Design a protein around this ligand. Structure first.
Ligand SMILES: [Cl-]
Ligand SMILES: [Cl-]
Ligand SMILES: [Zn+2]
Ligand SMILES: [Zn+2]
Ligand SMILES: [Zn+2]
Ligand SMILES: [Zn+2]
Lengths: 273, 273
């Protein structure tokens, strides 16, 4: 069956404008959305990222003032589509900052995929990365390494939280490509989805928070290598041009309000014939 | 004659707390001092850094709300000591962000020294570095490369604005060591001054803006490589321990108010014998 993309609306968080636009700002509170990307594909149901865990943010990062209603948890968002976590075959994480892996705990049955460097980074991050990598409930191994086993959902084991590590640009499935875009994090991935009858979508994820971020090459203040970060923005600019792909950003409220979420999706049949 | 250090008070600038403490903040306007370090040495008078140019900041970065009185320009500060720019034999720049090289224009006669990578960086900086490297009046070559020859003081030539490039930890003079501390910028240098009868001083310069910055390994948001930036903070922590050196920070108002400036200096005779 034809590839469809559903965006799982995961509520919102707040940072300073200086967090969102490194050094440029302007300052002041900025609320931004968090979402995950569900692909219904011939080869299976693939979930890219799993949003944030509300209790985690309220305990560890309450200054981010999370707003997330019951339909904006991963199980809640899947429920809107008549699905449950057990329906997802593969979970892919762009990276393991807390706002992209907070729902992994619900998928012990799924195959898990991430960049090869990301699990080791969560186990032993740079000192300035501890708060980004603060939810280790996605990995028994990383939780153990970080002294955070108390975060683990009951039933989580090393066996059911082991990732297949990947590297470079790689095909997840037919017309679904993971685009290596490191800098924001050591193994950060963006996502390119191709369709049978509409143009590709390039999900920048955290390689570019907002359209303005890309336009100005002003990345987020959270990064491990801002030189890599800029080069990954250029890679994204070009890949979208070269593919005629449409760009969708991770944490851009104005743009997010134009995005289909919930039961609305990308990849409609055309009724041409 | 015995080594003496005079701090040239160069007024102040404002940034957001998020600029000063990368990602940690808190936010809000923070005013911080800018100073240069004059060493009266047997081998000559060495000036490390030259503060900011007031007209440059008011034209290019007015949001930094510069305050600088006439005795806080480099000629003004030297005047407090009965000196003029012509009295300085060697100018060393820690790096070429505008707040450390704005007074170089006054020293065409002096030998100039900087890290080998810093002039090329000013000529062609990373896109996110353009505003840090925004005053090119210290170099005819860099001004030309950046389309900024209008910034040049009359009489400035390639001949009299050429630097001797250095690399690694190197002795500028007896008991004066330039400590390589890259990360904040590609060729950033800190400074260690040893005396005949008091403990060394390690001037962190921009490797650590404030005491709190060092204590928490929270560097400034302005950097090119934050991994290098942390490692340079560790190098500074250790070198100070190993030397029993006293730490002095670049942009720390609370600490700066305890520092000797103007006619007060470090390196007094002890009257013991
Ligand atoms: Cl569509
Ligand atoms: Cl003294
Ligand atoms: Zn992130
Ligand atoms: Zn994110
Ligand atoms: Zn600097
Ligand atoms: Zn500075």
């Amino acid at each position: 069956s034809d590839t469809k993309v559903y965006l799982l609306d995961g509520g919102s968080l707040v940072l300073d404008g200086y967090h969102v636009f490194w050094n440029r700002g302007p300052g002041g509170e900025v609320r931004f959305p968090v979402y995950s990307i569900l692909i219904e594909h011939a080869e299976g149901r693939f979930l890219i990222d799993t949003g944030y865990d509300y209790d985690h943010v309220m305990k560890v990062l309450p200054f981010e003032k999370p707003i997330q209603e019951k339909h904006q948890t991963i199980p809640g968002a899947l429920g809107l589509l008549g699905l449950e976590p057990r329906d997802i075959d593969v979970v892919v994480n762009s990276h393991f900052h807390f706002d992209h892996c907070g729902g992994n705990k619900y998928f012990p049955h799924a195959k898990k995929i991430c960049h090869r460097s990301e699990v080791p980074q969560a186990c032993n991050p740079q000192p300035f990365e501890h708060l980004g990598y603060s939810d280790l409930s996605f990995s028994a191994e990383a939780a153990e390494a970080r002294g955070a086993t108390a975060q683990l959902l009951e039933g989580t084991t090393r066996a059911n939280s082991t990732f297949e590590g990947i590297d470079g640009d790689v095909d997840l499935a037919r017309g679904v490509k993971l685009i290596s875009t490191p800098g924001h994090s050591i193994g950060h991935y963006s996502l390119l989805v191709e369709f049978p009858r509409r143009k590709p979508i390039l999900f920048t994820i955290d390689a570019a928070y907002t359209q303005k971020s890309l336009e100005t090459l002003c990345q987020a203040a959270f990064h491990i290598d801002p030189v890599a970060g800029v080069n990954s923005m250029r890679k994204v600019k070009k890949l979208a041009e070269d593919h005629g792909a449409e760009l969708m950003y991770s944490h851009d409220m104005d743009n997010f309000k134009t995005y289909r979420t919930g039961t609305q999706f990308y990849g409609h049949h055309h009724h041409h014939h």
